[PDB]
């Protein structure tokens with residue numbers, strides 16, 4: 001059921017000159033993210049933190065500090081270029097976590113191996129009044 | 144025998160969370176296939192706050208007016 | 210982590226999933242609409258709470274709803 | 290007025306007559322050649338399609354690229370057929386790219 005790829009380190013990184021927008025202490029002690037893609041050739045692209053970088057021909061591996069950074073870069077890579085990307089979350093333990101795309105398909109296309117999380121079977125006008133849930137820790141939309 | 148009001152009828156909205164609630168609109172299509180919980184398609188004369196002029200409704204949220 | 214809920218008035222247009230900047234939402238199969246599609250929110254521990262999804266939903270009233278809740282590092286959008 | 294419409298479709302290609310003051314979708318709804326829609330409000334890409342000839346009124350169309358209306362794609366549910374047209378159906382993803 002779609003084994004996810006592995007993180008292959010020794011994957012090179014783009015040609016950057018350095019910038020004051022990169023990783024900080026949070027990446028040392030809490031978490032950071034890593035994106036990888038393909039790049040048929042060497043080309044220039046706008047870093048999601050600073051100026052411009054040159055992606056190398058072949059696999060590319062970037063380390064960023066937020067999931068939103070990875071996803072904005074991936075959206076830019078996927079529409080303006082025709083490139084496939086995946087990104088991961090790395091902990092200070094040395095533990096990787098394949099993040100996106102989760103089950104191999106992009107979430108805007110319906111895949112038959114997905115369950116429903118957070119679905120209520122009624123309209124939004126049919127939530128109870130708050131007086132119905134007072135003094136018990138649930139919320140009216142919890143149901 | 145089909146379901147629901149006729150095509151191009153004049154119906155009154157009863158869904159109070161609707162922008163056009165207690166107003167009227169005109170039916171344009173009633174999905175006959177069951178398993179759909181909101182078959183009636185109603186087009187309105189004014190747009191709501193999201194700049195939209197048509198919405199789906201259930202059979203009992205719609206009441207025929209004359 | 211904020212809360213995101215999907216209601217059964219959804220017409221399965223997918224516009225909300227295309228808009229999420231943190232990949233919270235997803236399409237799953239269904240049987241209650243012409244699209245046989247419905248949105249789900251499996252990854253709400255990454256939701257920044259921008260309501261970019263709600264601006265995209267066309268139903269009246271909304272079919273996706275975001276309830277802001279307890280704040281964390283990921284929810285606040287902190288890079289440090 | 291009521292120009293003839295042509296829609297290529299995996300089911301084939303069929304024609305139906307229908308006045309210029311109408312949206313294409315309800316008119317393919319009349320005669321009964323089924324087409325894919327979600328919104329009926331011009332705010333998604335399920336009713337997307339492109340044209341073979343003529344061109345279709347896209348005044349009340351929105352949520353489109355400042356180009357999607359200059360290189361072929363059209364949403365069938367908010368579109369007025371100004372001419373005897375010849376159009377495509379089931380065209381969301383080659384529009385979705």
Ligand code: SF4
Nearest residue numbers: 229256258259260262
């Ligand atoms: S509020 Fe923003 S981050 Fe949260 S689910 Fe909606 S679009 Fe995604």
Ligand code: SF4
Nearest residue numbers: 219220222223225266
């Ligand atoms: S935008 Fe609204 S109707 Fe469309 S898929 Fe998302 S929740 Fe459903």
Ligand code: FES
Nearest residue numbers: 327328329336366
């Ligand atoms: S249904 Fe999506 S545009 Fe008409």
